[PDB]
Design a protein around this ligand. Structure first.
Ligand SMILES: *[C@@H]1O[C@H](CO)[C@@H](O[C@@H]2O[C@H](CO)[C@@H](O)[C@H](O)[C@H]2NC(C)=O)[C@H](O)[C@H]1NC(C)=O
Ligand SMILES: *[C@@H]1O[C@H](CO)[C@@H](O[C@@H]2O[C@H](CO)[C@@H](O)[C@H](O)[C@H]2NC(C)=O)[C@H](O)[C@H]1NC(C)=O
Ligand SMILES: *[C@@H]1O[C@H](CO)[C@@H](O)[C@H](O)[C@H]1NC(C)=O
Ligand SMILES: *[C@@H]1O[C@H](CO)[C@@H](O)[C@H](O)[C@H]1NC(C)=O
Ligand SMILES: *[C@@H]1O[C@H](CO)[C@@H](O)[C@H](O)[C@H]1NC(C)=O
Ligand SMILES: *[C@H]1O[C@H](CO)[C@@H](O)[C@H](O)[C@H]1NC(C)=O
Lengths: 136, 593
């Protein structure tokens, strides 16, 4: 249950219950529910070639779960991100700049799972159960 | 032990906490992934018995020691992968044994230089990947001479700071050598005066190297004297990243000759940089992930033959008038832009897919200004208003509107003028066909993909009568209940016919009589309860048929024919057709004589 806490939001993460391959992932600053430009530090060893990497996001505002969302970070050709060239077994140390614009009037209990998927082979790379809570 | 993804060929021994190699494994195998197992050492003869292996992967296998003659038995291996083993040093003849190797990956193997690297023995080697290592030098070794087939070396995420004359000296000896180099993620600061004199490279890749502009700028100046087929230049959002990026840094590029320039993600950006004059005589400009917002200031003397823009941020469509542009690609924009006319007499290939492109007045000569367009892809965009029947574009042979909102297409014969066209995709365009005359004009057409659409009264109507040459027709997912009388009489050359995922309530034998040439017929997931006797009897050339997911009434004698036909023809049925109620296979039912 790896957590920091901003003074308006407490962020904690953990592995998914049936997928627990390793990652050290971390944000600076610790995210505010309203606006945080900064970096996400990632350390792990990809179980598969990170070219064609993408995510499957299942989010839940106040325990009301949303539809699936599919973010691609690596299209496999001249990719924005350096870690897209990474290979199965090689180490990945990279802080990515992330920019959260916010939500003016944010609410309660958010909750996000994230499946990194190697698009080449559709195999599972890792899975992260997040949590974000407001105020007291 | 391992997973048998493919019986006696491919295995998946990944993360099996395997102390050693396993012995109970077949010898026939052409592939095995052994990654993530604690192998620690690599034994002499550790794979000597196995000897038909093309792909062997030992990524992250904790390896510290490659004993002489370890691979000894693997004379058909083309790909060996060693990513992420702490094999600090490789003994002379550490490999010698591998005769047919084409791809060596030694990424993150704690390697210090190429010179010691015992690979001069490998004649058939094509790619060498040694990125993510401790190399501090770009010196192309002398042993390259021996390596006739090697064309890609990857020196990424290393510690190289300088490229000297002597470093690349091997290449002045060898102008009859094809080679590409990836030098990305190296903190290069100093590239030596006249260090790139008299040398050819195929592609040079320099991204996320340079920290400052005057470092970058100086470095690009001493690139002088170079022929690259393809120059890739940029940085990554997760890196050493430039304070400022001006076109003035492109200076120096005017000395280097370039065939294919390729810019990628850059933090700071101004449009003018692609308009920059040293990029004028390039034979193929290209942009990926680029913050560019407009593109018009484009001198007509620029000799570019293909322009590509991929995942850029254009705010308004290019107005372009390059006389020599033969192939334009503008795909995956961020802005949901709208099409504006162009003038490109050389243009023969146009991919504008996957933007949210709108397009009032499609389409005719005036729109582009060419008589030689052969490939036009408008897929995955938005509102495309059909206002003109392709008059003046009769050379078109490939046309794609997948997932785009075609409008007015049911009002008139919008493809009338496309006498030569061969492939047409209007699937998921949400077209509800009102109009028998929708496909007039299309006499050469071979492939018609139109799944996801719909038909007035849900009735398949007589739209195919002037499309005799159709050999592929996909009408799946079209909410069809019925087929009108005439509708397939003309389709004598058709091989594949898809009508799965519809709501067909019945068949008429008369719809298949003249499909003389039909290899594949899919009628699966419909509402068919039964089939006219003998319906499939004259489909001479049929190889596959799908009939499952339909509530077949299996009462005898009604099910007599179909049940017998399947049992006579099982090799051809794909999937398994079942009786409603019981769920029993249809091939299995027998009737009382
Ligand atoms: C993600 O986190 C939550 C919290 O552990 C889990 O959703 C829960 O898990 C169990 C099993 O389904 C439920 O009975 C609980 O009610 C949930 N917990 C809470 C506090 O609501 C979920 O299983 C986790 N695992 C994932 C997403 O893989
Ligand atoms: C007929 O059309 C159906 C649906 O349009 C095709 O089924 C698709 O098959 C692909 C690959 O075989 C799958 O990944 C998709 O899931 C299928 N789509 C659906 C909606 O199930 C089927 O392949 C076609 N038959 C052919 C071309 O012979
Ligand atoms: C990741 O980055 C930090 C930067 O100091 C470093 O301390 C750590 O060792 C790095 N880990 C790896 C595996 O490179
Ligand atoms: C050199 O090889 C590349 C790929 O390695 C190939 O695509 C190209 O045609 C070759 N270059 C020349 C100039 O023949
Ligand atoms: C289909 O159009 C052709 C092309 O001119 C025409 O000759 C004919 O009238 C049409 N088909 C039939 C059966 O009349
Ligand atoms: C680039 O990187 C290093 C960071 O340690 C720094 O010394 C150097 O001054 C930086 N320059 C610029 C322009 O960012």
């Amino acid at each position: 249950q790896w957590f920091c806490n901003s003074s308006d939001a407490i962020i904690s993460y953990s592995y998914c219950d049936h997928l627990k391959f390793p990652i050290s992932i971390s944000s600076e600053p610790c995210i505010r529910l309203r606006g945080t430009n900064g970096f996400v530090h990632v350390e792990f060893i990809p179980r598969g070639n990170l070219k064609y990497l993408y995510f499957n996001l299942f989010i839940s505002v106040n325990s009301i779960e949303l539809p699936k969302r599919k973010e691609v970070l690596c299209h496999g050709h001249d990719d924005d991100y350096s870690f897209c060239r990474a290979l199965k077994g090689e180490t990945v140390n990279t802080s990515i700049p992330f920019s959260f614009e916010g939500i003016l009037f944010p609410k309660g209990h958010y909750r996000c799972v994230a499946e990194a998927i190697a698009g080449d082979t559709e195999e599972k790379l890792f899975c992260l159960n997040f949590t974000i809570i407001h105020r007291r | 032990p391992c997973i048998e993804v493919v019986p006696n060929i491919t295995y998946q021994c990944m993360d099996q906490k395997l102390s050693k190699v396993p012995d109970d494994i077949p010898s026939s195998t052409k592939n095995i992934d052994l990654s993530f197992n604690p192998l620690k050492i690599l034994k002499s003869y550790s794979f000597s018995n196995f000897s038909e292996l093309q792909w062997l992967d030992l990524s992250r296998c904790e390896i510290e020691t490659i004993e002489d003659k370890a691979w000894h038995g693997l004379h058909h291996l083309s790909n060996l992968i060693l990513t992420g083993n702490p094999i600090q040093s490789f003994s002379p003849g550490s490999f010698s044994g591998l005769t047919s190797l084409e791809n060596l990956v030694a990424v993150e193997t704690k390697l210090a230089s190429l010179e010691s690297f015992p690979i001069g023995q490998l004649i058939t080697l094509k790619k060498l990947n040694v990125a993510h290592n401790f190399i501090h030098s770009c010196k192309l070794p002398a042993y390259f001479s021996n390596l006739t087939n090697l064309v890609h070396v990857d020196l990424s995420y290393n510690y190289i700071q300088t490229i000297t004359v002597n470093d690349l000296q091997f290449l002045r000896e060898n102008p009859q050598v094809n080679l590409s180099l990836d030098m990305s993620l190296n903190p290069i600061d100093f590239i030596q005066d006249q260090a790139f004199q008299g040398i050819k490279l195929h592609e040079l890749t320099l991204r996320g190297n340079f920290n400052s502009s005057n470092i970058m700028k100086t470095c690009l100046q001493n690139l002088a004297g170079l022929h690259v087929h393809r120059l890739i230049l940029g940085e990554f959002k997760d890196e050493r990243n430039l304070e400022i990026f001006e076109p003035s840094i492109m200076e120096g590029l005017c000395d280097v000759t370039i065939d294919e320039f390729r810019l990628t993600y850059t933090n700071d950006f101004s449009d003018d940089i692609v308009k920059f004059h040293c990029l004028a005589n390039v034979s193929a400009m290209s942009l990926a992930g680029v913050s560019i917002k407009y593109l018009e200031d484009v001198p007509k003397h620029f000799k570019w033959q293909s322009l590509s823009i991929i995942r850029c941020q254009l705010k308004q469509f290019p107005t372009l008038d390059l006389p020599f542009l033969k192939s334009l690609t503008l795909t995956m924009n961020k802005g949901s832009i709208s099409f504006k006319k162009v003038a490109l007499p050389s243009l023969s290939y146009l991919d504008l897919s996957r933007n949210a492109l709108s397009f009032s007045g499609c389409c005719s000569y005036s729109d582009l200004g060419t008589n030689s367009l052969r490939h036009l892809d408008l897929s995955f965009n938005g509102a495309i208003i059909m206002s003109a029947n392709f008059m003046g574009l009769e050379e078109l042979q490939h046309l794609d509107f997948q997932h785009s909102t075609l409008k007015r297409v049911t009002e008139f014969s919008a493809f009338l003028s496309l006498e030569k066209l061969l492939y047409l995709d209007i699937s998921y365009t949400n077209t509800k066909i009102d109009f028998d005359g929708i496909f007039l004009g299309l006499t050469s057409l071979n492939t018609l993909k139109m799944a996801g659409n719909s038909f007035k009264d849900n009735t398949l109507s007589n739209v195919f009568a002037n499309t005799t040459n159709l050999t592929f027709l996909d009408l799946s997912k079209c909410q069809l209940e019925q087929i009108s009388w005439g509708v397939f009489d003309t389709l004598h050359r058709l091989q594949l016919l898809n009508m799965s995922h519809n709501n067909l309530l019945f068949l008429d034998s008369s719809h298949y009589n003249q499909l003389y040439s039909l290899k594949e017929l899919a009628l699966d997931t419909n509402q068919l309860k039964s089939v006219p006797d003998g319906i499939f009897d004259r489909l001479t050339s049929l190889q596959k048929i799908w009939l499952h997911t339909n509530p077949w009434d299996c009462s005898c004698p009604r099910i007599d024919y179909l049940s017998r036909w399947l049992n006579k023809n099982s090799q051809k049925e794909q999937g398994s057709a079942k009786c409603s109620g019981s769920g029993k296979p249809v091939r299995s039912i027998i009737c009382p004589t």
